């Protein structure tokens, strides 16, 4: 049995930690909603 609990407001935070790269990938999406890499 699943239940929900509030965790916060949805707001943009000024000077948040900035990280992560920006990869450009060729992908396929199947009927089950799974993504896969196409090479």
């Amino acid at each position: 049995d699943m239940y929900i609990e509030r965790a916060g407001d949805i707001t943009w935070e000024k000077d948040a930690e900035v990280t992560g790269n920006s990869p450009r990938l060729d992908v396929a999406l199947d009927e089950s909603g799974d993504f896969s890499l196409v090479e």
């Binding site: 049995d1 699943m2 707001t11 999406l29």
Partner: protein, 156 residues
């Protein structure tokens, strides 16, 4: 139950203790999360029940109490924030410049940030605080790292 707009954890007591299986967004009286988090099951909010209203396995999305309300889109240029809600941890904003998933049906923004599986459903926001999609459906790349699509629904 609580219907205030905001980000929420999705929990279960079926496994050991209380386990966070995902995250979702409450907006305009509708709860929004990824299909793989709930598998379309009903949810509890206090003594209230939230029943599924719309869902689609291929999009990996589901809404409860009403139709999908989130309609903002990544502009394709600017940094966004993932409002990560990890299991047992405080909600935290992480800013990043999305990459892109190129598909036969068009391009989608993607975020290269790594979190536990129970973080799925966490919202990705633009600079106006609008939800441009949910994090948690993606792929594992060459180096073992994770890249999530920015998954957004359609507001009918």
């Amino acid at each position: 139950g609580e219907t205030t707009d905001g980000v929420y954890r999705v929990m279960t007591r079926r496994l050991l203790g209380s386990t966070q299986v995902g995250v979702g967004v409450m907006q305009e009286g509708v709860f929004h999360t990824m299909w793989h988090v709930t598998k379309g099951a009903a949810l509890r909010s206090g003594e209230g029940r939230l029943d599924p209203y719309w869902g689609d396995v291929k999009q990996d999305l589901v809404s409860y109490c009403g139709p999908w309300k989130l309609d903002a889109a990544w502009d394709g240029l600017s940094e966004v924030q993932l409002l990560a809600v990890p299991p047992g941890e405080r909600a935290k904003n992480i800013q990043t410049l999305p990459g892109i998933f190129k598909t036969k049906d068009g391009d989608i923004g993607a975020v290269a940030l790594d979190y536990p599986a129970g973080t799925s459903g966490s919202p990705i926001l633009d600079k106006c605080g609008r939800v441009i999609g949910l994090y948690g459906n993606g792929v594992v790349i060459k180096n073992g790292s994770y890249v999530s699509a920015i998954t957004q629904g359609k507001r009918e």
